[PDB]
Design a protein around this ligand. Structure first.
Ligand SMILES: CO[C@@H]1O[C@@H](C)[C@@H](O)[C@@H](O)[C@@H]1O
Ligand SMILES: CO[C@@H]1O[C@@H](C)[C@@H](O)[C@@H](O)[C@@H]1O
Ligand SMILES: [Ca+2]
Ligand SMILES: [Ca+2]
Ligand SMILES: [Mn+2]
Ligand SMILES: [Mn+2]
Lengths: 240, 240
């Protein structure tokens, strides 16, 4: 496909256009839940949920690159210590058939801290627990752009909020010509915005076709669930 | 999804977002080839090609029905007399996992001429051969709106033209509001067009999540390949 766009205003439990891995799934309240909390989960648990059809990210014959924009609102819920809750969620591009890996601080995308070009992953993380708990991260909750590694290229301090009472709207735009990836988180209750920009050439990083989706993880003791409220996306090789 | 749209301007030799059944494939010439022709094939033969992602056509909780549009250009090729060349191609909606059924005059969609609701198929056909060759269609080539059967609830005469220099503009719509489906064909060359409109309630025929694709069929001794150049497709639950 050259152009693609799909909007989910809700999420039905009988959906047929989303593949889930780990313990992610749509729930009765029509919410896309990325990770389950409570008992009977491994110490590092989480889930991935991606659009069933692989996106045509770049064309190897024309050399053309596709620009894209995606928006979604998510909220988080925790029972105990919020400031100490792990680990967050992610929006990512990767080979559509990539397995679910290590959860917790690795979000399900990476199996350890070693950076490897073979991941062909580009994720915009919303990390809720950093150093010293998560060594490789800055000393505070934040947002970052992950390129083939759990360690961001660039990041921004995020003062995380929990509860349905604090829904966050995210919007990511990747400008193909300037290779600029910009993601912003905005708490609508008060317009508390934040954004992390970066210049990454997806043509070098990602494969011809990739999946676009989400991932969410937490940790025993510091459990919290991360869930998507809706989603929008639009790809296009043909400029604007 | 709630809203969805894509656009293929041509096709990738190694695509990842299409499902192929029968002898359907993308030829090295970047064209969707619904069916192939040759002495290595059975008497009745064809193929199916669908967008790998199931579309949400209607939602049983709100009783909502989506509206849609699909456009495409196609041409055909044959070593047989156009007059006698079979069988045509269709654009269809049906269970995402519909097995490849009998081809020939049955477009890969039907077992035989018996009308069955268990098909849950809504196709728009571009039939090149009717009676006497096939004891069920009009005695000439035509287009038609098929609902759960290879027998059109409505049809229009179709003066088929062959070859790349005789490509055709099909523009199918479905205004959910009024429950009317309407196919269209325009031969760009001299700007002449035909159509068919038939009120068909998709909610009473198709499952919530259906597939969208094409099919091309042919018969021994009258073999022809049917190919699509491009394919736009949009659908949305918020009317329009
Ligand atoms: C051992 O624990 C470390 O901190 C936890 C909060 C998680 O991020 C886990 O994946 C990481 O390895
Ligand atoms: C003998 O063949 C009949 O006519 C051909 C044109 C095809 O429609 C075939 O499927 C049908 O059985
Ligand atoms: Ca972290
Ligand atoms: Ca026929
Ligand atoms: Mn981080
Ligand atoms: Mn017919």
């Amino acid at each position: 496909s050259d152009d693609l766009s799909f909007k989910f205003k809700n999420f039905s439990q009988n959906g047929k256009d989303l593949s889930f891995q780990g313990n992610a799934s749509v729930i009765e309240t029509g919410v896309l839940q990325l990770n389950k909390v409570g008992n009977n989960l491994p110490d590092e648990t989480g889930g991935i949920a991606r659009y069933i059809a692989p996106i045509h990210i770049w064309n190897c014959n024309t050399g053309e690159l596709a620009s894209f924009i995606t928006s979604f609102s998510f909220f988080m819920e925790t029972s105990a210590n919020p400031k100490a809750a792990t680990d967050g969620l992610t929006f990512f591009l990767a080979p559509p058939d990539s397995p679910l890996r290590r959860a917790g601080g690795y979000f399900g995308l990476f199996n350890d801290t070693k950076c490897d070009s073979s991941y062909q992953t580009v994720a915009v993380e919303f990390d809720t627990i950093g150093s010293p708990v998560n060594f490789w991260d800055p000393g505070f909750p934040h947002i970052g752009i992950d390129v083939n590694c759990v360690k961001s290229i660039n990041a921004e301090r995020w003062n995380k909020r929990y509860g349905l009472n604090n829904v966050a709207n995210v919007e990511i735009i990747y400008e193909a010509s300037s290779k600029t990836l910009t993601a912003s988180l905005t708490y609508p209750s008060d317009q508390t915005s934040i954004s992390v920009t970066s210049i990454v050439d997806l043509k070098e990083i990602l494969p011809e076709w990739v999946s676009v989706g989400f991932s969410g993880s937490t940790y025993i003791g510091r459990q919290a669930t991360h869930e998507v409220l809706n989603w929008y996306f639009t790809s296009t090789f043909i400029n604007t």
